[PDB]
Amino acid sequence: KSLTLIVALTTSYGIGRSNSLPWKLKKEISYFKRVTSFVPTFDSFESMNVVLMGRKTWESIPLQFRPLKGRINVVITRNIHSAKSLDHALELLYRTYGSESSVQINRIFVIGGAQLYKAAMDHPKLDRIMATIIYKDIHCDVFFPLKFRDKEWSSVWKKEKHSDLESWVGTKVPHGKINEDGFDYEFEMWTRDL
Template identity: 30%
Template sequence: MSKENTTGEQPGDFTEQLRASTTGLGLVWAQTSTGVIGQAGAMPWHLPEDMQHFSRLTTGHPVIMGRKTWESFPAKYRPLPGRTNIVITHQETWGGTPAAEGAIAVKSLDDALLESQFAPGHEMVWIVGGGEIFAQSMELADVAVITTIDAATEGDTFAPELGYDWTAGASLPAGGWLTADSGTRYRITLWRRAEG
């Protein structure tokens, strides 16, 4: 934990608070300070602390993603354990291939959202990527949980911009940064979209 985090709150405690205070449809991603979320189909950083946060936040709930995001996870982590994995793809036969094992394949975001309502933990559904799926779901989402990584990393995929109808809520730390074991600085922020 960073010396800059003076609250004494641990990332795991903060994630549990987020789990207890969010329902509906959520977006969750990590990005650099310049908005990079991916490079050549992968995350251009290694931050185990954020992966632990992501796992704690989404476990027990359906997760929706695009096929490329599914394929970006190492095979040993597919499907993401403890979650109903719903994958959006335009490839009609993909759902019957070995690459899709453990996933529910659907054709659209609408189909994914409908499928999620039959899954355990459906009171909170998480959109986990990639960029196109985030953009499609932005107007439907209630919350966004964003990890900002203090790194200058090149990328080819960028986070969507939250509009004026989004407001920052809880953040860890409240000011400054946490420092990972690797020395990388990061912070986690909960955003809420105004009901409109």
Template identity: 35%
Template sequence: MKTALIVAMDNERGIGKNNDLMWHLPVDMKFFKDTTSGHVVVTGRKNYDSIPERFRPLPNRENAVLTRNAAYEAPGALVFPSLEACLKHYADETERTVFIIGGGQIYKEAMDAGVVDELYITQVDHRYGADTFFPAFDESEWNVETILEQGKDEKHEAGFRIKRYTKRF
């Protein structure tokens, strides 16, 4: 099983505010969609609930939702009580990548557990006053390459670059 994490964050590591995205960046949204299509996406319940209903579950992906609420239902998605249970379910997955897509608590859990093989991080050149943040990590443990750069323009309120991190060992 290959596990990846995909996130966009601002200059203060902010990833969300009031359980919502803080920016509208079409090229980044297309990158997210193209990168995760055909794979598994794992999200926490609050993050899943923040996705507009008409887009739930995310199309062309197997959706997995993490929640401690045993009664929670997410039609069209699998529900797991923990990240550990979810990853155990996908342990024999060989065709698809398991993408951790948020939110903050799930990112922290995945990074702390050391289960992530690859990171896709969009660094947005702005500060948004977030209330949810991506955890700090030791970048020296990763090989890094910039795979996309987008300047500020009429469709993008801020410039950004997307970096791909792969484990060094």
């Protein structure tokens, strides 16, 4: 099964500031909730998505939102499911939600932070980035680890047609720039060959 990473980052790959998001974007939060908690209509009795996150990200989420509803949550920590790496998480999942289980696994998302992102980009099953691009240079102190939208990575990572994005996330997604509270930002989907 493939992994998908989902992130919102600035044109300078900023993702974070002071253990939180440096923007308060209500429509971006909804896209995130929607993409990660969406499952092919016919499977939706059985099927559930998984959200894999680092311990720091786990701790950053306002309590009212933990665990993230309607998704299987696994926190990765070297020391709610906990596993010690991405692959341990995958073994826990297959073992726990085995054909003998009534909950089934649809898509598995890596939702942050930088350290987990870095491991997910190293993972041979990761082939898709759902990137929210924020066209401002907001000060940040945590950064996305690999510059997948830059020249150096452009033979590996390709940005897909907007209609391919909508086909994947299964609904109309705004095209182009959305303005909210001082920010322009745009939804993208990038893939690479496995």
